[PDB]
Amino acid sequence: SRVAKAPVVVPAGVDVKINGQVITIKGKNGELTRTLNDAVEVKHADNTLTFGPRDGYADGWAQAGTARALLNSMVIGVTEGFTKKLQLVGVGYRAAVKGNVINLSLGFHPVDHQLPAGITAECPTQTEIVLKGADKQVIGQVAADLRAYRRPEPYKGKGVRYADEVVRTKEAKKK
Amino acid sequence: LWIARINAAARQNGISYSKFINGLKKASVEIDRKILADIAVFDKVAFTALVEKAKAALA
Amino acid sequence: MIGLVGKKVGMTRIFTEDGVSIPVTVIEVEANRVTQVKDLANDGYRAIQVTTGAKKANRVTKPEAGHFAKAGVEAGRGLWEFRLAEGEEFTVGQSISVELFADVKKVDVTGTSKGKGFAGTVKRWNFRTQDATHGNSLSHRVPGSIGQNQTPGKVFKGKKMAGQMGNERVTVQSLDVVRVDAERNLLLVKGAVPGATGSDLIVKPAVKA
Amino acid sequence: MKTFTAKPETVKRDWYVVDATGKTLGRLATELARRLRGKHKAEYTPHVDTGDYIIVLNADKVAVTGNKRTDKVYYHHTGHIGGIKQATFEEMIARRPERVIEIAVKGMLPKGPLGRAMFRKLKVYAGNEHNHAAQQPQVLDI
RNA sequence: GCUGAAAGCAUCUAAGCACGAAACUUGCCCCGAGAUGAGUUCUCCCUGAAGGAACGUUGAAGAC
RNA sequence: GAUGUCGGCUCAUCACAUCCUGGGGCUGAAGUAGGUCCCAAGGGUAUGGCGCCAUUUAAAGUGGUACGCGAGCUGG
RNA sequence: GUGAAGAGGGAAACAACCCAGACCGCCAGCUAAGGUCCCAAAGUCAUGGUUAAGUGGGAAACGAUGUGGGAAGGCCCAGUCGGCCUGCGCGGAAGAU
C-alpha cells in the first residue's frame, strides 16, 4: 500500500504502449507484456503509470502493490540491468561456460545445460563467475540453474555458493 | 400433462405460468386447465388474447 | 521403413572361421512389386501396398484381375501393405529387391505361429500338478479352485483356463541378419523365426534401438 | 371431448446452431436438454419425441467456475477384473471435447428407448465449421 | 526454487514463471467398426450377371 | 421340514498401517554403515528339521474376502 | 402415539418417523407435511448480507496473521499495538470387488 502510492519516476528512452490490459515497454531492454489483473486500472500521465483499483474487485490495492512492486523491475532493470555473483570452494567439480552451453564434470557423465539470450557470463578468475542480464526473474532462474548442481554441503563448506551468503559449519560427531 | 401444456404456451408469450394463473384469478375467470390446454393447442388467437388480458389485470 | 515378404524354408547351421557354429534360418524371397501407393491428401496415411508370388488364371476373380491390371503387374499369392516412413517415395510397378537389407543388421520377424489345438491348462498357462498317490482320487490335472465363496459370486474376467492354443500372429524382435544372397534371392538370419515351413513371414527393421 | 395427442407422422422439426464460447456448462446443458425433449412447444406429449435438432460450435472454448478446472474428476470402469480409470477435466478437454458435452446432457434426459432417440438428435462439433449447411439452420441465442 | 505485495523489510503464492519419482497418460506386443457414431480407399456386375454355396482329393488347419 | 468343522495341495483377488527396489527432510548425518519421518501399491518376496534351529537371499511385509477355496483333492 | 387389525402423500429405497383415516364413479376446483434448474408437475422470482472451503454433502481434545460485524483501550504530525464477546470457514481425518 505504502509501496503502491509512491510515484516511481520512469525515465526516457522508453515507450508506454498500453494496448488494453497488456503493457508494452518496447525500449532499451525489450518488452514485457501480460494481461494485467482486470482490477488494477492503469493510466498514462507523466513519466509514471498511475495504478488504482477498479470497483467490484476483491484484492484491489493488494494487486496494485504487485503492479508497482514486481513491475518496479520494469522501471529499473531495463536501463540499469542486474548482475549476480557466484563462487565455489573445494576442488573436484568443473562447470565451464562454453557459449550458451554450460558443461559440467563432477566425478559422475558430464552434464549439459543452456544459457538464454540476454545473459552474459564472465569468469575474471577460475572460481568466481559474474552473470549479467536484463530481467530479475530470468537471472534468478539461471542462478537456480547454476547453484543446484553442487549445492553447499555444510560440513567443510565445499560446493558452489553465493558471494554474500553465510553458511554455518559445525562439528563432526565427537562420539 | 395439462399444466406443462399451459406453461409452455404461456412462456411462448412472455409470462410464466404462476403469474398467468395469478392474473386469471385476480381478473375473475374460472376456466380450468383442460379447456385452457385444448385452446392453447388448437387456436393460438384466443390464447394470446387471454394472456394479454391476464397481463393487463396483473399489473 | 519398409520390409519384405518371404517364405520360411528350414533351419540350418553356419560355421564361422574360428570354429563357432551359428544356428540360422533361411527365408526365400521373390521380388516384391509395388501395386498401390497411398498418401495424405486422399486417405490420411502414407503407405505402400505390395504383392508377391504367382497365381493361376482360374483362381483369380474378375475385380482382382482388373485391380492388378491397372498397375500392369502380374498376379500374386497375397497382398500386404507397409507404412511408409515419411520421406521415401516409390513409384507404381517398381520391384523391391533384397539388396536393401545390407546395412540394417537388426530385424524383427512377424508371422503366424503353429497351432496345438484344444490344449489343456498345464500345457497352456504352466500350472502345477497335484500328488499322484497318498489318497488322491480323480484329480491329477484339473485347475482347482477358481475363486471365493458367497462374496464375489462371480469368476472375474480374464481368468486363466483351458482353450485354443496357438495359431496366433506373433513377432520376434532383435534378430541378427547374417547373410543376404541377392543372386539366388535368399536371406539367412540367426535365430528361430515363428511358424512352420511354407508360411509367409514379414521382415522389418527393428523399431527399437 | 378428449385431450388430443400429438401424432408422430405429422410432427415438424427445425435446425438450430448454438455458439458456446465463454458459457458455463450447466446453464447451457439445461436449455439444450429442455429444447431436445420438446418442452418448449405447445404440442407436448411425454411419449412422442417433438424436439429440435441442435448443433453446438466451439466446444473446446467452454468454461467452468472455481477450481473445477482441475478438481473435477471423470471416472469409468472397464468392466474387467481390477481396473478403473480416472481423468481430470483438463486432460479430457484436451483429448476430446465432444464427450464432455455428450456426458452432461445424457444424464439430464430420461432413460430408455426414448432417451437414446432424443440423444440421437444432438450433434456437437469441436471447431467452428459444421457440415450441415444444406438444412439451413437458424442461429439461436442461449 | 525465481520475482513478488497484502504487512515500506522479510516470504515458494494471493497474480504470473522454472525443476522434480520403478508412480500417471504416451511409447513396446496383441485383439479391435454389433464403435447400431455400424467408418476409408481400388477394381468388378446388372439397360439369371459379378460372385457365393453344395460335391470331391486333402493339409505342418482341426472336438463337429 | 439341515448354513459341512481346523491344517496341507492347486488357484487367486484387493487395501496400504511399506520387507526389497525409486524420490527427499532432519540427525548427537567426516565416509562406510546407521535412526526416524514425508511421498510412492508398477514388479518380487526361500528350502529343510522337532514357538526354536541349520543355511541361502535385495527381501523372506501386515491384513479382510463364511479366520478365501471339500456340487476341486486330502480325512492327518 | 403408531404398527399388530390402515391404504394415500413426503423422508432416493425405508410395518413402528411428519401430514392425513379410502362406500362407488368423472379428462372439475381449493389446500396440509414437503417443494419450484433438468431427470420429475411448480420462481433460472423480489430486496439486504455471509461463505471460496465443493464448506453445504460425517466427528473430538487442541492449533493458526482466513474472513464479516461490535465494545473498550495505550502511543501518535499517519498510522500502529495486542487483549475480550460474536456469525461463517481451515488442519486434526488411513481399508480392504
Side-chain angles (χ1 to χ4, degrees), chain C residues 44-177:
Chain C
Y45 64 99
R46 308 168 86 258
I48 70 194
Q49 186 173 355
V50 308
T51 192
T52 166
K55 212 154 176 51
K56 331 219 289 202
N58 182 358
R59 288 292 188 192
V60 168
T61 67
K62 186 77 52 204
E64 292 303 20
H67 170 77
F68 285 149
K70 162 160 37 175
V73 310
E74 328 82 8
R77 280 184 296 114
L79 297 208
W80 286 268
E81 60 165 315
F82 287 115
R83 298 296 299 278
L84 245 192
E86 49 269 59
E88 294 93 326
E89 192 77 329
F90 287 136
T91 56
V92 180
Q94 180 185 357
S95 173
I96 287 180
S97 66
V98 77
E99 166 154 331
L100 151 63
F101 296 161
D103 205 11
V104 152
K105 217 62 61 172
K106 285 308 153 281
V107 280
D108 65 338
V109 185
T110 278
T112 303
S113 64
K114 270 192 216 325
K116 293 184 175 71
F118 200 3
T121 89
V122 185
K123 192 50 163 312
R124 181 177 181 170
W125 293 124
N126 284 277
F127 283 155
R128 282 175 259 184
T129 315
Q130 303 164 350
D131 289 345
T133 85
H134 315 119
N136 203 6
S137 39
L138 279 204
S139 162
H140 297 291
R141 282 161 110 103
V142 288
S145 293
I146 39 184
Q148 242 80 346
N149 210 73
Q150 232 191 27
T151 8
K154 62 188 183 82
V155 296
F156 289 145
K157 266 198 185 238
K159 183 67 164 68
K160 313 218 211 162
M161 292 153 93
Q164 156 101 28
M165 181 206 157
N167 174 339
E168 176 156 49
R169 224 273 285 275
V170 175
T171 286
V172 162
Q173 258 149 26
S174 298
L175 277 193
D176 318 335
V177 82

Side-chain angles (χ1 to χ4, degrees), chain C residues 27-61:
Chain C
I27 300 184
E28 144 199 357
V29 160
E30 285 196 359
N32 310 307
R33 66 184 182 277
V34 181
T35 61
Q36 205 163 18
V37 164
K38 297 173 178 172
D39 50 18
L40 188 147
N42 160 247
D43 302 338
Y45 64 99
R46 308 168 86 258
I48 70 194
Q49 186 173 355
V50 308
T51 192
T52 166
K55 212 154 176 51
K56 331 219 289 202
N58 182 358
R59 288 292 188 192
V60 168
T61 67

Side-chain angles (χ1 to χ4, degrees), chain D residues 5 25 33 43 47 60 73 85 87 92-93 98 102 117 136:
Chain D
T5 294
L25 191 43
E43 292 305 9
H47 58 81
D60 48 345
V73 296
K85 311 287 191 181
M92 190 154 252
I93 184 94
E98 294 146 309
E102 278 190 356
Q136 280 148 4

Side-chain angles (χ1 to χ4, degrees), chain B residues 1-2 4-5 8-9 11-12 34 37-38 40-42 44, chain D residues 1-6 34 39-46:
Chain B
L1 194 43
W2 298 329
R5 213 157 279 207
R11 277 202 155 250
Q12 204 176 342
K34 175 176 77 169
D38 157 82
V41 162
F42 276 137
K44 276 93 162 193
Chain D
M1 294 60 92
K2 319 184 88 61
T3 302
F4 177 80
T5 294
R34 210 183 67 96
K39 287 180 79 67
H40 70 278
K41 283 184 184 178
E43 292 305 9
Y44 181 69
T45 327

Side-chain angles (χ1 to χ4, degrees), chain A residues 1-24:
Chain A
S1 181
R2 218 178 313 276
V3 282
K5 283 195 186 304
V8 46
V9 43
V10 202
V14 311
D15 201 346
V16 188
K17 183 178 179 180
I18 306 171
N19 207 357
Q21 313 291 327
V22 280
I23 312 297
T24 279

